Design a protein around this ligand. Structure first.
Ligand SMILES: [Fe+2]
Length: 156
């Protein structure tokens, strides 16, 4: 719901910062990044799992991006009753990239998605409200800082 882009020399001095539908889309698409707003009106119950959240927003993946054979979709949820929430930070906080642009849609929970393109650091908040998809060759990392639960959908 927000986009920030400053020079690599000004990391704390967020120079350009704005949060608008056309504004976030113009900045994202202007860099070859797709962006859309999805409606999370599908209820999977109180706790959202990967298999269910998968079958429900499954029909939404068909309109997301039609290309290649799309191997499959997966979900990344963190539970507080699983000691793997602490080690999972170094596990998702490292740089991981693929040679194909993947898309991620959050249906339950919010995560801070940071993008790195050239000498600029992008800071955009992600919520189960809309959707975000970055290009291949572009590294992305999730912001943990804590052990909160968040449901995400990966398609590539
Ligand atoms: Fe990825």
């Amino acid at each position: 719901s927000a986009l920030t882009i400053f020079s690599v020399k000004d990391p704390q001095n967020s120079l350009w910062h704005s949060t608008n539908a056309e504004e976030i889309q113009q900045q994202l698409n202007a860099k070859g990044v797709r962006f859309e707003r999805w409606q999370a009106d599908r209820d999977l119950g109180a706790a959202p799992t990967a298999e269910t959240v998968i079958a429900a927003y499954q029909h939404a993946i068909d309109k997301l991006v039609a290309e290649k054979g799309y191997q499959s979709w997966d979900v990344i949820s963190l539970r507080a009753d699983n000691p793997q929430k602490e080690a999972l930070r170094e596990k998702f906080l490292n740089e991981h990239t693929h040679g194909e642009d993947e898309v991620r849609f959050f249906v339950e929970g919010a995560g801070l998605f940071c993008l790195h393109i050239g000498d600029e650091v992008f800071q955009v908040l992600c919520e189960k409200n809309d959707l975000i998809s970055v290009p291949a060759h572009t590294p992305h990392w999730f912001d943990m800082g804590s052990e909160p639960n968040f449901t995400a959908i990966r398609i590539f």
